[PDB]
């Protein structure tokens, strides 16, 4: 559709008739995408639109089934979405959450970390772990725990599965806090395997070359790498003198024995240097190759989604001494300043971006 | 005591560790308090029970103490009135700035940015403690200044916020407060600085304001920060206001040559003093006092004569807890080194 020697951008044909403010995303592991506004949610497998009327939603694993909806302080769970062509349709579980809806607080980020459960974060920084299976395969909606004791959570990611019902989950905050939690659906307690603050380290790595990093450095996102102990971070600094924004990818290696880390590598994007004025948008890291369990490729393609652009770069998969021996390329897909990105998704080969009026764009890195 | 050809510094008590106090030369008394008691003395009674303010007598009399959301007034400090304030004490909010603007009353500001006008006299000259009005509808008030007394019980008050809102209010004990001036000067100062100092964008902050000899002109103290070179610049902006059109013009802009360090102590607030109110302006910083001179009349001979800018450097030990002033000098209250007095010979 639109291709060069490195990647392909295809428009696809999906089209949702709503409206005038949309949210949504697309989960390729479950195999379904959903898009919702203030009145209804539309679900559809990525292989017409099944509707649930009534707000932030998430699909669960079951063949088809599973929808969680958070509205205010109320969470409602339908274990089988496949058992609905009804209008109401009330075979749901409910849970009142300790969310202060009157104080302007709303749910912001949420992750599906099955078989453990669901992790939610709020605009005020609180973090909830919620269980959907209750120690007997039964479907429930119980509060697991709180993981919080002008800062906010900016990323929630899945770690490896440590056993039956147990999984690691990574949490990153805008002020530089990084945590690796072990959560489980089973009768057990949450436990922090990693709890560090990487803010000062990235700051020290940038301060000599970019003094204006002090007072402007902010973390936007993080993403795990092929090694369980390594994480990628997306930060930004701002030079108010020249009115310039710099974006930084930092590869950090963690050590669960000593609860410590070391900055492995630091890269400043050459192709995108614009500030994020729309405070509702959060730039995101995508490593599609991370989805294939048997990934045997020397190069790792990372994509960064910005409100009107997708930056594509390559690094070495193995964080060794040959890492910087070969200089890599950095390309960009410049979208029209019109497109309103409302969500994203990804599989092992490509990235999917949901616009409000241009459909679902697919970025496929040929490698 | 310590003098050169331009000014004099005279040195002129018991400990406890947070301290709060000031010195009012118009009333003629100084005040200092901790968490337990307050000491008052004309320029040494003790009152136990927190932010205090001396009121005018009706020779000696009067003291207001604010603790949490409760204010208590003694018409004579040697039988009190009480008032519950809409201050959210559980939400970590405290009273921060307070001004005696008699005969109108008392004006308070909070850490959260709310402003209270409170009356102490109630239509008969009778001592009261009633709420007059709210004047508020990461910003905070940085200066509360008295203006002219415009009649029986009425007085002008100037309010300056951190972000640049400047307001001239006409308050009175007898009414309905009316804003005579309400402008935002932040963008104007920023425009005056952005070409020469591009790093002003994102760092410009207003610290204080002071009236000038003209009712329509004010002096503003601001700071900008250069993160590249870790430098802090301080800016005196002379601004002339027009009450008819609620407008203003930047008359002049001066960057201090002699003081350029940041204020890491987030509890300190630098202060302008113009004790004649040539015009000698002093600026009190945590560990220094900058003395500069300008022309009184804001005319065309304003910048015809270049003026000197000197500094009095104190030890980095001195903990300034408050200040005051009369018509010839400025008084600075330290915690352990007494009450320093700066007298500009002119």
């Amino acid at each position, epitope marked *: 559709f639109t291709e060069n020697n490195r990647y392909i951008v295809k428009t696809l044909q999906t089209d949702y008739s709503s409206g005038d403010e949309l949210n949504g995303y697309i989960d390729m592991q479950i195999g379904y995408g959903l898009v919702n506004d203030h009145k209804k949610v539309y679900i559809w497998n990525i292989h017409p639109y099944i509707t649930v009327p009534f707000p932030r939603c998430i699909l669960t694993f079951p063949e088809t089934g599973g929808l969680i909806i958070i509205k205010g302080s109320k969470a409602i769970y339908y274990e089988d979405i496949n058992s609905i062509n009804n209008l109401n349709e009330k075979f749901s579980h409910e849970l009142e959450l300790p969310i202060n809806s009157s104080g302007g607080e709303k749910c912001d980020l949420m992750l599906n970390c099955e078989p453990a459960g669901i992790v939610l974060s709020t605009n005020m920084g609180r973090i909830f772990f919620i269980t959907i299976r209750n120690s007997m395969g039964k479907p429930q909606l119980k509060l697991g725990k709180l993981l919080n004791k002008n800062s906010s959570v900016v990323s929630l990611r899945n770690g490896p599965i440590l056993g039956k019902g147990t999984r690691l989950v990574y949490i990153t905050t805008n002020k530089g806090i990084f945590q690796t939690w072990q959560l489980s659906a089973t009768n057990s307690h949450p436990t922090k395997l990693i709890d560090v603050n990487i803010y000062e380290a990235i700051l*020290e*790595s*940038l*301060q*000599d*070359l*970019y*003094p*204006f990093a002090h007072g402007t450095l902010k973390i936007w996102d993080s993403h795990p790498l092929q090694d369980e102990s390594s994480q990628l971070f997306l930060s930004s600094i701002y*030079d108010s003198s020249c009115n310039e924004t710099y974006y930084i990818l930092s590869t950090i290696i963690f050590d669960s024995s000593s609860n410590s880390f070391t900055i492995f590598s*630091t*890269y*400043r*994007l*050459n192709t995108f240097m614009e500030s994020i004025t729309d405070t509702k948008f959060k730039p995101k890291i995508f490593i599609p190759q991370m989805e294939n369990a048997n990934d045997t490729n020397e190069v790792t393609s990372i994509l960064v989604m910005f409100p009107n652009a997708v930056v594509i770069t390559q690094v070495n998969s193995k964080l060794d001494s040959s890492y*910087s021996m070969r*200089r890599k390329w*950095e390309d960009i897909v410049s979208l029209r300043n019109d497109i309103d990105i409302i969500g994203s998704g990804y599989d092992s080969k490509s990235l999917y971006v949901l616009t409000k009026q241009m459909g679902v764009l697919q970025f496929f890195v040929k490698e | 005591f310590t003098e050169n050809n331009r000014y004099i510094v005279k040195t002129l008590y018991s400990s406890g560790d947070e301290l709060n106090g000031y010195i009012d030369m118009q009333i003629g008394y100084g005040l200092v308090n901790d968490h337990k008691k307050v000491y008052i003395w004309n320029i040494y009674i003790t009152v136990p029970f927190p932010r205090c303010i001396l009121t005018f007598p009706a020779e000696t009399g009067g003291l207001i103490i604010i603790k949490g959301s409760k204010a208590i007034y003694y018409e004579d400090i040697n039988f009190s009135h009480e008032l519950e304030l809409p201050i959210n004490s559980s939400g970590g909010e405290k009273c921060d700035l307070m001004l005696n603007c008699e005969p109108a009353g008392i004006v308070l500001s909070t850490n959260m940015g709310r402003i209270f006008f409170i009356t102490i006299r109630n239509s008969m000259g009778k001592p009261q403690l009633k709420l007059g009005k709210l004047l508020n509808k990461n910003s905070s008030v940085v200066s509360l200044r008295n203006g002219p007394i415009l009649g029986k019980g009425t007085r002008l008050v100037y309010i300056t916020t951190n972000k640049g809102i400047f307001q001239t209010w006409q308050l009175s004990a007898t009414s309905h407060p009316t804003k005579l001036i309400d402008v935002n000067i932040y963008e104007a100062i920023l425009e005056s600085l952005q070409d020469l100092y591009p790093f002003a964008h994102g760092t410009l902050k207003i610290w204080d304001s002071h009236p000038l000899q003209d009712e329509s002109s004010q002096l503003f103290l601001s700071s900008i920060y*250069d*993160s*590249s*070179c*870790n430098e802090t610049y301080y800016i005196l902006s002379t601004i002339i206001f027009d009450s008819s059109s609620n407008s203003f013009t930047i008359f002049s802009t001066y960057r201090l040559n002699t003081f350029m*360090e*940041s204020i*890491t102590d987030t509890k300190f607030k630098p202060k302008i003093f113009i004790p004649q109110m040539v015009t000698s302006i002093l600026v009190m910083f945590p560990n220094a006092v900058v003395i500069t001179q300008v022309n009184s009349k804001l005319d065309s001979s304003y910048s015809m004569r270049r003026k000197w800018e000197d500094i009095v450097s104190l030890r980095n030990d001195i903990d300034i807890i408050g200040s005051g002033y009369d018509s010839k000098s400025l008084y600075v209250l330290t915690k352990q080194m007494g009450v320093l007095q700066f007298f500009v010979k002119e």
Partner: nanobody, 116 residues
């Protein structure tokens, strides 16, 4: 690419030193160069830095220290005037190179500075 530091030792309170670090390698001019120090018991802090984007000093050494560097060669001098006992510590030099967005750090191995 190594960094060799010179100028350390012992000095009386109120004295002065001039630290220097000049070593280089194959690659050309470093983009930024800086002096850090680790005092006894305290943590390692940046002391001064110089780069295209500005020259930073720490408030505790401002006015007494001068970081300088010729554009032609990768040499940095730190003129330390009016020294205090609080200035005693191990001083390190740091170079930072930026090529196509790739940012690399390089550290000298330190120099002891004692003030009486």
């Amino acid at each position: 690419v190594q960094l060799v530091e010179s100028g350390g030792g012992l000095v009386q309170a109120g004295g002065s030193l001039r630290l220097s670090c000049a070593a280089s390698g194959s690659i050309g001019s470093l983009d930024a160069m800086a002096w850090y120090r680790r005092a006894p018991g305290k943590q390692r802090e940046r002391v001064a830095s110089i780069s295209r984007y500005g020259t930073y000093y720490v408030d505790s050494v401002k006015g007494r220290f001068t970081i300088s560097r010729d554009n032609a060669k990768n040499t940095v001098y730190l003129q330390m005037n009016s020294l205090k006992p609080e200035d005693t510590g191990v001083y390190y030099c740091k170079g930072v190179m930026e090529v196509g967005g790739v940012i690399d750090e390089y550290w000298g191995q330190g120099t002891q500075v004692t003030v009486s």
